[PDB]
């Protein structure tokens, strides 16, 4: 059996563990994703015409200022649908190549370990055939009654 959630939700298994898989896949700290996943702050996507970045952690007041100034072109949302949208748009091979070039061009011990961890995770995802959009779960299974 199964449950249709009618609203995307995140998997605590991967979101909340010390080497957060989704957190370092997004290359952003755990606190920002935790705040956006519980509707404390928004996150924007695209908006190239406006000054907003690709991964802004703009809050409600910043959102009001943006919609008063920028108006349109601000695709900002808060729910797990936000992580949906920003995870589907991510390109695996291009990001892996860009990060590999960044790691090989600049030598620094502090960033080298994080870069290698990110490369390892990305390569594992592209090789296993999984889709990173599957971290969060749209449909939730249920156990058999006799168990």
């Amino acid at each position: 059996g199964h449950i249709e959630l009618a609203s995307p939700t995140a998997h605590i298994w991967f979101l909340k563990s010390l080497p957060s898989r989704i957190g370092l896949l997004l290359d952003m700290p755990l606190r920002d994703i935790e705040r956006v996943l519980y509707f404390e702050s928004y996150v924007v996507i695209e908006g190239g015409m406006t000054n907003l970045e690709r991964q802004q952690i703009l809050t409600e007041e910043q959102y009001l200022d943006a919609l008063e100034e920028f108006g349109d072109e601000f695709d900002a949302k808060m729910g797990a649908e936000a992580i949906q949208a920003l995870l589907k748009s991510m390109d695996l091979e291009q990001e892996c190549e860009q990060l590999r070039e960044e790691l090989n061009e600049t030598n620094s011990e502090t960033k080298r370990k994080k870069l290698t961890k990110r490369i390892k995770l990305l390569e594992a995802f592209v090789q296993s055939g999984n889709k990173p959009e599957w971290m969060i779960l749209t449909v939730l299974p249920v156990l058999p009654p006799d168990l």
């Binding site: 298994w13 991967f14 563990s17 010390l18 080497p19 898989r21 290698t116 390892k120 995770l121 594992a124 995802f125 090789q127 296993s128 055939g129 999984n130």
Partner: protein, 241 residues
């Protein structure tokens, strides 16, 4: 002392004050521009490629002169971590260290245990070498020595011998050596299962049921003892198709 030390030895924990070691030729260098940071920066040229070490000056320096200090020498007094022993003095040196220090705990009380049973445990702590050269699809990552040995054997056999990449062996405690094995069914039944399944689920790996706990869990014949003979028959059929 005591025997929160057979635990302390097997996990290979770094002690409070490790003793520093040196390299091939320890010429007199003292310290150049010893500022308020770690002073007495020793820079032995050793002909080429000098090694710059930093000491916080809170620990005395032993060898004032050169005396042609070789690798593994005691630059400063103190207990030695097993990791330093393995990196510099060799694999046989760390085995004699752990065996002698563990047996000291048992001998002092009056317990007889053969040295064979400690070298077996140490052998399971000396897996997973770190690769430092490339060309064989590996570059600066920790892989099992068994896989590193077979990769070298095939690469050396072929004409392109230079592809074979040397490694730097690594030492892991018992609690960290068991959780990192290639079978995810094992190491999920012993310590943190939330972390082990999460990294196995993402990587999409398989177990292949090669050990003892994997076969015990699924109710098959273990590959040891009277079940060893049966497991060999299955292996040859798999290779033959």
């Amino acid at each position: 002392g005591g025997l929160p030390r057979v635990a302390d030895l097997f996990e290979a924990r770094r002690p409070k004050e490790p003793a520093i070691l040196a390299e091939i030729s320890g010429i007199v260098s003292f310290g150049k521009e010893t500022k308020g940071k770690r002073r007495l920066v020793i820079t032995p040229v050793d002909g080429s490629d000098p090694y710059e070490e930093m000491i916080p000056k809170w620990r005395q320096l032993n060898v004032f002169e050169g005396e042609r200090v070789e690798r593994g020498d005691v630059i400063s007094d103190g207990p030695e971590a097993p990791h330093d022993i393995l990196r510099l003095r060799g694999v046989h040196a760390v085995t004699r260290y752990i065996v002698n220090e563990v047996q000291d705990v048992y001998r002092l009380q009056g317990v007889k245990i053969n040295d064979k049973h400690i070298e077996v445990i140490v052998r399971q702590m000396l897996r997973k070498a770190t690769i430092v050269n490339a060309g064989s699809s590996d570059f600066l990552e920790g892989e099992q020595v068994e896989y590193s040995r077979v990769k070298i054997a095939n690469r050396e056999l072929e004409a392109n011998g230079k592809v074979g990449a040397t490694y730097s062996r690594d030492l892991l405690g018992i609690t960290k050596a068991s959780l990192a094995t290639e079978s995810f069914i094992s190491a999920a039944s012993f310590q943190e299962t939330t972390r082990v399944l999460t990294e196995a689920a993402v990587a999409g790996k398989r177990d292949e049921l090669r050990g003892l706990k994997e076969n015990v869990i699924v109710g098959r014949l273990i590959p040891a003892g009277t079940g060893y003979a049966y497991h060999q028959d299955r292996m040859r059929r798999r290779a033959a198709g």
